[PDB]
Design a protein around this ligand. Structure first.
Ligand SMILES: [Zn+2]
Ligand SMILES: [Zn+2]
Ligand SMILES: [Zn+2]
Length: 519
């Protein structure tokens, strides 16, 4: 039905390891972490920036009327300990976000809720938590203008690095050091550059690159001192603009155009993250101690695919927009309007401004989770991650178990229900056009088997495909597992060799895994 495709896989080219940390997830259950066989679990997000560990509570920020709400438990840090217990109960490494913003939540009498923009204290506003906290306004006047001189102490308390160090001490005491099997990843806040938006109530002015640098040096030292075996992750920036412009400049730009970036101008025209990395590198050179271990950013496509729009046009965009993660000649079809090639960009930035620093995308989501288009896209993302050498990744939230996207992940980490996974040694696999059909390959170390994932992104018609192998002696038959809109991981009939190649027909919008044993 569709034009035939030839995919060549050379087990001897592009050889490099695939860190299983690329299959990371945020907010999943022990059951899911175990079923999907994911080794990384992330506790992060907007509210985690306002978490007070001694009170065991946080502020929802712009997400929910800037309300300070406590957890049921009054035990300092139980949220974190419960998160960690659930993670290792599934054999997964946990990541805990440690506030750096300073203003964390505090509570009222008997752990009662507090609000940063009390309507009674600041006047009528365009929004409020009418159903659960009517006095909690959205911080916007009826005129549409933001409320301004609000007192940050209304629902918060100013804390510092020594305060957070205490949490690290609590963590190490309860779980041990990282070297001993305790918390391995400490994340420094969340999307700091846009604190002036998400955490407007407590940080109305965007942070300069100086203040983000100082906070990482400061908070990073405190944590390393408590646990030198632990790994620090940051800066968790939000997206494109936050890669070259500090929060101060992003905000300034929004208010006066982009003809003059003050913070950038005071730093020799340097780009934000490159400068931050270089700045950390210099400090590492002066003290001889590494404070940052993993360079992390978040990335969500901007063309509108993040959501549930499953029209043909959007599905096609999802088939393409995925290039922004690796393709150097792909201009993002959005306001970004530039060649982002994320992973190569992150790798080059680390290699150029702070060698030895790992790379990660701690937040991403291409949408359409309950739709096959979302699954082919997710499977595409996972393949790209392993091929491009991303060190770690954390999908923003875990897809529902009934979803086809959930299976897409499973196709890589537990396709047979036996925890069998995609290979750990990436090898070259080239497809003539990833937009309609992409492929990824690797060689498993335990089995020695060659695993080849083929994604047919075409919206209709069967697609005949032939896989040509190079430098791999395989048995006469390759196993086949497949996923389609039928939302079921099917174990198809084996396919036979025809020398050093195998052919098969690929259904439209499908994820097929080929397990080719060695010898
Ligand atoms: Zn600040
Ligand atoms: Zn304690
Ligand atoms: Zn400076």
């Amino acid at each position: 039905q569709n034009p035939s495709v030839t995919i060549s896989v050379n087990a001897n080219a592009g050889r490099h390891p695939i860190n299983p940390a690329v299959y990371g997830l945020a907010y999943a259950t022990t059951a899911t972490l175990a079923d999907l066989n994911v080794p990384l679990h992330r506790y992060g997000g907007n509210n985690t920036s306002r978490y007070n560990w001694q009170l065991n509570a946080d502020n929802r920020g712009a997400d929910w009327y800037f309300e300070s709400i406590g957890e049921a438990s009054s035990v300092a840090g139980e949220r974190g300990d419960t998160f960690i217990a659930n993670s290792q109960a599934a054999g997964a490494q946990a990541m805990i976000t440690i506030p750096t913003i300073g203003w964390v939540a505090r509570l009222g009498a008997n752990r009662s809720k507090l609000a940063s923009f009390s309507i009674a204290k600041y006047g009528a506003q365009s929004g409020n938590d009418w159903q659960w906290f009517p006095d909690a306004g959205n911080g916007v006047l009826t005129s549409g203008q933001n409320v301004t001189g609000n007192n940050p102490n209304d629902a918060n308390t100013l804390v510092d690095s020594t305060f957070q160090q205490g949490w690290a001490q609590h963590l190490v005491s309860q779980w041990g050091t990282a070297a001993g099997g305790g918390l391995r990843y400490y994340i420094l806040d969340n999307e700091p550059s846009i604190w002036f938006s998400t955490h407007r109530d407590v940080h109305p002015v965007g942070p300069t690159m100086d203040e983000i640098r100082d906070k990482m040096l400061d908070y990073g030292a405190k944590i390393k001192t408590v646990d030198p075996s632990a790994l620090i992750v940051g800066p968790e920036e939000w997206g494109w603009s936050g890669y070259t412009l500090s929060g101060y400049d992003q905000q300034y730009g929004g208010l006066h155009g982009w003809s003059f970036m003050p913070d950038r101008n005071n730093h020799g025209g340097w780009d934000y993250l490159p400068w931050l990395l270089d700045q950390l590198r210099q400090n590492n050179l002066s003290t001889g101690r590494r404070l940052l271990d993993v360079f992390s950013v978040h990335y969500y496509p901007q063309g509108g695919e993040f959501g549930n729009d499953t029209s043909s046009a959007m599905q096609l965009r999802r088939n393409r927009s995925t290039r922004s993660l690796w393709d150097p000649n792909y201009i993002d079809e959005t306001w970004i309007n530039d060649k982002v090639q994320l992973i190569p960009r992150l790798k080059n930035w680390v290699s150029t401004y702070y060698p030895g620093t790992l790379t990660a995308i701690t937040e991403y989501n291409w949408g359409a989770e309950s739709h096959i288009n979302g699954a082919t896209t997710q499977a595409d993302i996972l393949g790209i991650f392993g091929r491009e050498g991303l060190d770690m990744a954390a999908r923003w939230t875990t897809p529902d178990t009934a979803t086809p996207t959930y299976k897409a992940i499973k196709m890589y980490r537990n396709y047979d229900g036996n925890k069998s996974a995609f290979g750990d040694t990436s090898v070259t696999a080239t497809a003539p056009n990833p937009d309609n059909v992409s492929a990824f390959a690797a060689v498993r170390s335990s089995d020695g088997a060659l695993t080849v994932m083929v994604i047919n992104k075409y919206l209709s018609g069967n697609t005949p495909a032939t896989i040509n192998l190079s430098n791999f002696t395989a048995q006469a038959q390759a196993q086949v597992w497949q996923l389609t809109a039928a939302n079921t991981i099917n174990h198809l009939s084996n396919v036979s060799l025809s020398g050093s190649s195998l052919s098969l027909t690929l259904p439209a919008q499908s994820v097929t895994l080929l397990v080719i044993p060695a010898s």
